Amino acid sequence: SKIQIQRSGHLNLYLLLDCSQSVSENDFLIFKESASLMVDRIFSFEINVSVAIITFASEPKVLMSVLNDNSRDMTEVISSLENANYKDHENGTGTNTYAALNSVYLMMNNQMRLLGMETMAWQEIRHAIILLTDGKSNMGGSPKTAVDHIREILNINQKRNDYLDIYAIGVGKLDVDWRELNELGSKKDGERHAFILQDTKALHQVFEHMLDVSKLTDTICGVGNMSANASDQERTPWHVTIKPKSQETCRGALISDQWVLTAAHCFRDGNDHSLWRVNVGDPKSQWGKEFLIEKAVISPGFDVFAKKNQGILEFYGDDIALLKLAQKVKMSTHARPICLPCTMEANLALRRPQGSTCRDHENELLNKQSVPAHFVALNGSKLNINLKMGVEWTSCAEVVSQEKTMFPNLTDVREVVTDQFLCSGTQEDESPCKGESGGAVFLERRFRFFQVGLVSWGLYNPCLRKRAPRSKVPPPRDFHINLFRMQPWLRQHLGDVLNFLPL
Ligand SMILES: *[C@@H]1O[C@H](CO)[C@@H](O[C@@H]2O[C@H](CO)[C@@H](O[C@@H]3O[C@H](CO)[C@@H](O)[C@H](O)[C@@H]3O)[C@H](O)[C@H]2NC(C)=O)[C@H](O)[C@H]1NC(C)=O
Ligand SMILES: *[C@@H]1O[C@H](CO[C@@H]2O[C@@H](C)[C@@H](O)[C@@H](O)[C@@H]2O)[C@@H](O[C@@H]2O[C@H](CO)[C@@H](O)[C@H](O)[C@H]2NC(C)=O)[C@H](O)[C@H]1NC(C)=O
Ligand SMILES: *[C@@H]1O[C@H](CO)[C@@H](O)[C@H](O)[C@H]1NC(C)=O
Ligand SMILES: [Mn+2]
Numbered sequence: 001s002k003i004q005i006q007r008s009g010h011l012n013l014y015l016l017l018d019c020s021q022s023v024s025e026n027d028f029l030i031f032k033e034s035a036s037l038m039v040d041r042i043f044s045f046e047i048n049v050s051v052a053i054i055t056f057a058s059e060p061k062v063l064m065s066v067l068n069d070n071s072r073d074m075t076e077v078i079s080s081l082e083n084a085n086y087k088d089h090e091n092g093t094g095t096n097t098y099a100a101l102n103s104v105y106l107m108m109n110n111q112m113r114l115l116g117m118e119t120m121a122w123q124e125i126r127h128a129i130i131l132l133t134d135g136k137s138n139m140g141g142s143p144k145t146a147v148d149h150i151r152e153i154l155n156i157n158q159k160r161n162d163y164l165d166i167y168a169i170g171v172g173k174l175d176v177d178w179r180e181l182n183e184l185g186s187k188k189d190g191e192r193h194a195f196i197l198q199d200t201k202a203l204h205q206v207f208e209h210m211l212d213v214s215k216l217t218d219t220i221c222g223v224g225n226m227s228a229n230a231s232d233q234e235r236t237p238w239h240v241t242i243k244p245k246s247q248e249t250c251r252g253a254l255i256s257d258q259w260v261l262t263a264a265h266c267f268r269d270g271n272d273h274s275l276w277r278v279n280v281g282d283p284k285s286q287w288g289k290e291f292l293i294e295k296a297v298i299s300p301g302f303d304v305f306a307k308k309n310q311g312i313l314e315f316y317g318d319d320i321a322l323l324k325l326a327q328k329v330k331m332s333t334h335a336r337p338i339c340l341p342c343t344m345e346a347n348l349a350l351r352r353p354q355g356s357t358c359r360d361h362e363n364e365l366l367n368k369q370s371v372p373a374h375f376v377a378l379n380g381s382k383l384n385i386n387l388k389m390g391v392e393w394t395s396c397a398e399v400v401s402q403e404k405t406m407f408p409n410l411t412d413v414r415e416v417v418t419d420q421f422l423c424s425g426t427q428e429d430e431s432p433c434k435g436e437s438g439g440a441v442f443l444e445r446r447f448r449f450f451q452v453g454l455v456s457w458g459l460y461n462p463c464l465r466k467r468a469p470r471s472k473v474p475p476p477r478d479f480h481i482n483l484f485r486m487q488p489w490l491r492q493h494l495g496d497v498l499n500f501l502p503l
Contacts, residue, residue: 003165012049014127019089020058050066098146102149171199222336233380237333237334246269263438264302265304266438274292278290278325310409315415319457386426397421422481453483456480
């Protein structure tokens, strides 16, 4: 009933953009913006996908054909779309949707001819057509007739139901013809295939629900669900709960199908890992699934009382741990590894050049003096922070000299906050609670998720679903272990787990 995101076979996606005079010039820019979002998203899954781009009024115009190998190149698809001009159809501003759909038919006929009707290269292709239109066809005859023709060539019935989806979406400040939208994108079973949406934000939500990713079960990193209607676990599937002996909880992140990344300070009782449990996401229950631990590696530099002779009562240098789960996790919508920077996995996720390095990844991901990021709350919800970098890191970390509990003897901030920590908590940031520690601090780029740090400590615990700030000294401020500073140790233990880039 949905567009299938999977490794096997091939996806042909046809984007048909209504460029007729009932679509204003600005309405068309909204269409181009929606198309670009669907292209960027469909490519984020690293599946085999070709994209055709057609604009249409009285005549259709093919900017990209699936017969062009360039339609598998996200770069060339996006440029051909951005090259699309409203005035391209100035000589025929009517609305001939049939002609636009027939253009897709002729495309299919030609590729089937190319590859060969009887070949698997042709049989394996799934076809998804999305029309961005206000639905007001007024020439060429019935779009349904061209849809019948497409369904004929593709051999669609109940069995081969999954090889064609047609969607018709009106996005923007349009006068939409609803009846016509529904003729174009009729229902498959119960699944809606016609939508009227106010803007590209609504489209982005709706497109998430058009994509079936349940069959995507390999270890692809940093894939999430960005619908509000998805569960918390589906939105952050790397996210895990950690249960030490101490009965207190921590959070952590799946970084492969068997390894979890978390905070060292979570394990106060010591190093007896056989009493610890991890809850990873699971489709069958919101409780998740409990795993035991095969082995634990706590950073050898971690020791909360290391600086206690200097009157510093808690020191969180090297606050990091790796847990190997007793079994491999089964990858699913509720359980995926997050992307770790400085790996080939993360380099592909970012669509970067081959010979990138760790420095490159740091530079791309932590690209500003204030970098918007997230951590996941106790209730599973996604919370917002701004990582303070370069010159702003110093003034961010400065307020720890006002801490009254942890450090009664502190003549030097850089004895407690070293270069090992990212910093947030200023302005209107959320601050992690103690139970949220160990959890990923992560960014989103190109629709993929990247762990740049982990929750370690802060000056103010809001949980001391329910949360509270205040307005007195010292101010909230939070310090996260920076994964870019932990590379040597991570490589020592994950070198045969992930493929690390040159430094
Ligand atoms: C983002 O998350 C949403 C919410 O889970 C995903 O939509 C869901 O997609 C699944 C997979 O096909 C649908 O499963 C079907 O459920 C119906 C019951 O209503 C059942 O009859 C079928 O047997 C099948 O199991 C599910 O309906 C659907 N849920 C909603 C609210 O639409 C979406 O696919 C996810 N997208 C991405 C990009 O990860
Ligand atoms: C819009 O049409 C004009 C005019 O084209 C002429 O009249 C049309 C109705 C049609 O019958 C054409 O065959 C005629 O040529 C186009 O302007 C022409 O562009 C061509 C090729 O680019 C060029 O050789 C001429 O200078 C132009 N002809 C005249 C007489 O103006 C214009 O390109 C069309 N707009 C499009 C399709 O973007
Ligand atoms: C989860 O906690 C956040 C953090 O304050 C809160 O905003 C959100 O409403 C909570 N979700 C609920 C109430 O289930
Ligand atoms: Mn029109």
